[model samples]
Target: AEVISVHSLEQWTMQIEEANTAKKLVVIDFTASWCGPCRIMAPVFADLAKKFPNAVFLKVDVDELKPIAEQFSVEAMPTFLFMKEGDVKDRVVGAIKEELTAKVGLHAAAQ
Candidate 1:
């Protein structure tokens, strides 16, 4: 799968809710332009999206969608939200080894 960017809150909401309705796991990656780690993780996320085609990959720009970030109480860059049915099933605030891949894979598979 190709890397996808979430440009607006509307697009973000639409995809997430659609994933919810379809019983799919929506992986929301909260990133920012100024964040170094976010830049580093972008490719890793892209690879993961390709590896897991069944899951939804979404990039939420922190500066552009501050309200949505605040709605999820995201306080840091690359905040990964594994959501199902419009509800967050799991959340990871910072980078970790294999944690995101495992959580998202498990949740999405279980659903």
Candidate 2:
């Protein structure tokens, strides 16, 4: 599936609800425009979304959606949250490409 950007609280709410009911793996990348690490991982994240079409890939800008970031307790930039059925299965915090790819592959296989 294509990466879905959560631009507002309403959109975030709807997407999460839909993902929960659909029972699909969700890979949420909590990012920020000003973060250097986030910029580095941007393309990697997008590539994963294309690679894992069965998974729901989402991007939430911390500055744009502070509440959503707070809801997930994102303390740093480039925090990747892997979730399924509304529950977080794993997380990777940084711009580590290999680890991110591994985790996404691991969770996508679980689905």
Candidate 3:
């Protein structure tokens, strides 16, 4: 029902693991403090979380999770990653609410 703010690698690791096993869509927003685009998408992300109760919404600050961002090779702000069972299914960059919602629905609708 809400976006889970990730702060540590341990928390990140555990969250992903649980989502993998639970068979839910893991929608991640990779954001940073100084990113204007990220700020724009924050509330949109919150609404998405409210709409998709069955899916898991995660928000990670790149400054706090730089190594983890490196793992995904994330280079842009507000980079949204859609994952299922530990595998990335789609990626959306920037603050486009349409593409993000479309991908979210697509992935979460699939069993």
Candidate 4:
């Protein structure tokens, strides 16, 4: 699946609820436009989204959605939150390619 950019809180809420109902794994990339690490991981995240069709890939700009970032307690720039049924299962805090790929593969294979 393609990565979905969350532009508003309402859209984010609706997507989460839908994913929960569908019992899908959600990979939320809490990022900022100005972060270099976030820029580095964008392509990798996009590729993984295509590789894993069963999962939902979401990108949230921290600057654009402060409430959502605060709600998730995101202190870092490229915090990747792995969630299932609206509950966080795992996370990757940096732009490490290996760790990100592994976690996505691990969770994607689980479902």
Candidate 5:
């Protein structure tokens, strides 16, 4: 599957703004290249996005989007934030697939 790339802060903000306007569920994966768990979980996250088509999955490279990551208080890589109307409704901080899926599923139901 082709993992959607979110490279810059402007792109990130634009995507989130669109999601907010559409009232869609938004999930941001905060990661870094140097983070081992992030690399390992990349495909899993990609697959989850494939499974949940209506939900917007965003990949935020903590190294590249430092200010955005800092704004969200992302201290570790592979942090997942589930949002509705651009507001965080749930978050997962590590390699916990079940927890992440459960939260995303719940958030998707809001749509």
Candidate 6:
């Protein structure tokens, strides 16, 4: 499946609850349109969605989901957060391909 693009607070909350209910790993891409690193990692993120079908891939624009961004304490654009059962499990805060892949694999396998 493809990544779910989320914008609204209610929708975001529902998805998190839904993912937690299903006992699935939640992978969020906290991105901004102006961030160059985010642009660079978009396709990799998409491919990760396809590669790891067991995880829930979500894309949230920091501007559109401002409060959610603050809730996650996301200060950097393109921050990748992996959560399971509504708890944060790991964080990858840059566009580094190797680290992202490794972290994703590490977490997704545990899920």
For 1-111, candidate 3 gives per-residue lDDT tens digits of 999999999999999998889888899999999999999999999999999989999999988999989998999989999888878999999999999988888888857
Give per-residue CA lDDT, model 4, range 1-111, as digits (tens).
Answer: 799999999999999999999898999999998999999999999999999999999999999999999998998979999999767899899889999999999998864
Clashes of 2: 1
Estimate every model's Cα lDDT from 0 to 1.
0.81, 0.91, 0.92, 0.93, 0.84, 0.93
Clashes of 4: 0
- Tens-digit lDDT track for model 1 on 1-111? 765687887787777677777787778899998898888788888888998888888898888988988999988888988877767789877776388778867876754
User: Candidate 2: where is the Cα deviation over 4 Å?
Assistant: none
What shift in Å separates residue 69 of candidate 1 from its native position after superposition?
A: 0.3
Instruction: Name the Cα RMSD for model 5.
Output: 1.5
lDDT by residue (43-104, candidate 6, tens digit) is 99999999999999999999999999999999998899999997899999989889999988
TM-score of 3: 0.96
True-vs-predicted CA distance for residue 94, candidate 3, Å: 0.6
lDDT of 1 at 73: 90
Least accurate stretch of 10 residues (summed lDDT) in model 5?
A: 1-10
Using all chains and alpha carbons, the TM-scores for the candidates as numbered come to 0.90, 0.95, 0.96, 0.96, 0.92, 0.96
Cα-based lDDT at residue 87, candidate 3: 88
RMSD, every candidate, angstroms: 1.4, 1.0, 0.8, 0.9, 1.5, 0.9
State the local distance difference test value for candidate 2: 0.91
Inter-residue clash pairs, candidate 2: 1-53
- Model 5 CA lDDT for position 1: 27
